[PDB]
Paper text:
[name] ([name]), a leucine-rich repeat (LRR)-containing protein conserved from human to worms, was recognized as a major FA component and is important for FA formation and cell motility. Among the IAC components, tripartite integrin-linked kinase ([name]) associates with another two key players [name] and Parvin to form the [name]/[name]/Parvin (IPP) complex, which acts as an essential platform to recruit many proteins for the FA formation and signaling and provide a linkage between FA and actin cytoskeleton. Here, we solved the crystal structures of the [name]/[name] complex and found that [name] strongly binds to [name] through a large concave surface on its LRR solenoid. These results indicated that [name], by interacting with [name] and preventing [name] from binding to actin, modulates actin dynamics at the FA and thereby regulates the stress fiber formation and cell adhesion dynamics.
We prepared the [name]/[name] complex by combinatorial usage of the purified fragments that contains the elements necessary and sufficient for the [name]/[name] interaction and successfully obtained the crystals of the [name]ΔC/[name]_LIM5C and [name]/[name]_LIM45C complexes. In the [name]/[name]_LIM45C complex, the nine LRRs of [name] form a curved solenoid capped by the helical regions in the both N- and C-termini, named N-cap and C-cap, respectively. The N-cap consists of the α1-helix while the C-cap contains three α-helices (α2–4). All the nine LRRs adopt the typical LRR-folding by using conserved leucine residues to form the hydrophobic core except for a few short loops inserted in LRR1, 5, and 9. Consistent with our biochemical finding, the LRR-solenoid of [name] interacts with both the LIM5 domain and the C-terminal tail (C-tail, folded as a α-helix) of [name] through the concave surface of the solenoid, mainly formed by the parallel β-sheet and the flanking loop regions. However, the LIM4 domain in [name] adopts different orientations as observed in the two crystal forms of the [name]/[name]_LIM45C complex, indicating the intrinsic, structural flexibility between the LIM4 and LIM5 domains.
Numbering used by the authors:
A (entry chain B): 189 to 318
B (entry chain A): 5 to 251
């Protein structure tokens, strides 16, 4: 027989939305955050739920460790964290960095080579053994 | 130094970098405290022993970095910075923080690594800093972490590496946002079961706990992996043994 909607469990006689392994009425297939129907617009999926682009990025987009905002544009990934390209910088002198720089990991923060050299010897000796 | 101040006011540069310039006194930096427009000030790797109350005049500061000086105390005015989000006091000589330090309304990252702080160093209102998402207390002298640590509900990162902790407060279990817990190099023997309310087994998460005199079953579970550790401290067996270990 004809498809049945996944949200209201009723037969779909007219136009059918095919998404996430289910069939939907156009009005009943909506974003999980805001209750707004996609109406043809691209949807984004996450854990069996559909979201609009703006709310998808807000809930699941990478957040910058420095400016604490959802990153727009390219992401710098390092040390289990993420930075905006223009935010990535040394944690001890704030000089901007790229992944092409030789920085060290210090309590899971990036520290530039020049800064690390200035650390106390007793600390550097302990960090090597760790 | 008189050219990094003049050019910052002429071209309206919000970021001032005076790292490693042999500065022994901020009041000696000509015109520094007239730059009310700046949002970032870096004074790391200098020779500062103090911070003057004039710091309050830089009212738009969002980033303030004093890493690796010899600062021994801070003025109360440090907490009047309404826009301050990042404060690096790492590698100094602090054994106290000033009255009302916890009044900073927007502070997100606080770095106190490598000083001489203990629980007694913290002002009564320290844990009013509820906007904090990262707190670094590595290389200090904490024996006890106050239970009010639980008031810091947005905390994602907590480092207590290389302190003198004999115990972890169960209130750490209330930190539902926590992603990183660094507790290497203390004097911990057991973990509170309430820590199991947290899950730090994720790929993006960190749980570092080496170099503690853990009781044998906990040390054994570490050798198997973080998943095993958290499974264990959630178990009825651990709860039974923990209750008897305390009494
Ligand atoms: Zn329907
Ligand atoms: Zn939406
Ligand atoms: Zn950013
Ligand atoms: Zn650096």
């Amino acid at each position: 027989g004809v498809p049945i909607c996944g949200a209201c469990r009723r037969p779909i006689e007219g136009r059918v939305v095919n998404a996430m392994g289910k069939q939907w009425h156009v009005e009943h297939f909506v974003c999980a955050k805001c209750e707004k129907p996609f109406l043809g617009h691209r949807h984004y999926e996450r854990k069996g739920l559909a979201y609009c682009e703006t709310h998808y990025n807000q809930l699941f987009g990478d957040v910058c460790f420095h400016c604490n905002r959802v990153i727009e544009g390219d992401v710098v990934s390092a040390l289990n964290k993420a930075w905006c390209v223009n935010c990535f910088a040394c944690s001890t002198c704030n000089t901007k960095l790229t992944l092409k720089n030789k920085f060290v990991e210090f309590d899971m923060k990036p520290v530039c080579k020049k800064c690390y050299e200035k650390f106390p010897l007793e600390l550097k000796k302990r960090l090597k053994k760790l | 130094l008189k050219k990094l101040v003049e050019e910052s006011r002429e071209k309206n540069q919000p970021e001032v970098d005076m790292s490693d310039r042999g500065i022994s006194n901020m009041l000696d930096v000509n015109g520094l405290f007239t730059l009310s427009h700046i949002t970032q000030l870096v004074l790391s790797h200098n020779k500062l022993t103090m911070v003057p109350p004039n710091i309050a005049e830089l009212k738009n500061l969002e980033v303030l970095n004093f890493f690796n000086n010899q600062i021994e105390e801070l003025p109360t005015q440090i907490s009047s910075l309404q826009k301050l989000k990042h404060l690096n006091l790492g590698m100094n000589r602090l054994n106290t923080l000033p009255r009302g330090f916890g009044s900073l309304p927007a502070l997100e990252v606080l770095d106190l690594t490598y000083n001489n702080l203990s629980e007694n160093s913290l002002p009564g209102n320290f844990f009013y800093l509820t906007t904090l998402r990262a707190l670094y207390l590595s290389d200090n002298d904490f024996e006890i972490l106050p239970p009010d640590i639980g008031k810091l509900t947005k905390l994602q990162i907590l480092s207590l590496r290389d302190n003198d902790l004999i115990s972890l407060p169960k209130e750490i279990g209330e930190l539902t946002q926590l992603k990183e817990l660094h507790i290497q190099g203390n004097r911990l023997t057991v973990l509170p079961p309430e820590l199991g309310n947290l899950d730090l087994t994720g790929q993006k998460q960190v749980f570092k706990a080496e170099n503690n005199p853990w009781v044998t079953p906990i040390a054994d579970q570490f050798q198997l992996g973080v998943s095993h550790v958290f499974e264990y401290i959630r178990s009825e067996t651990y709860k039974y043994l923990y209750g008897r270990h305390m009494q």
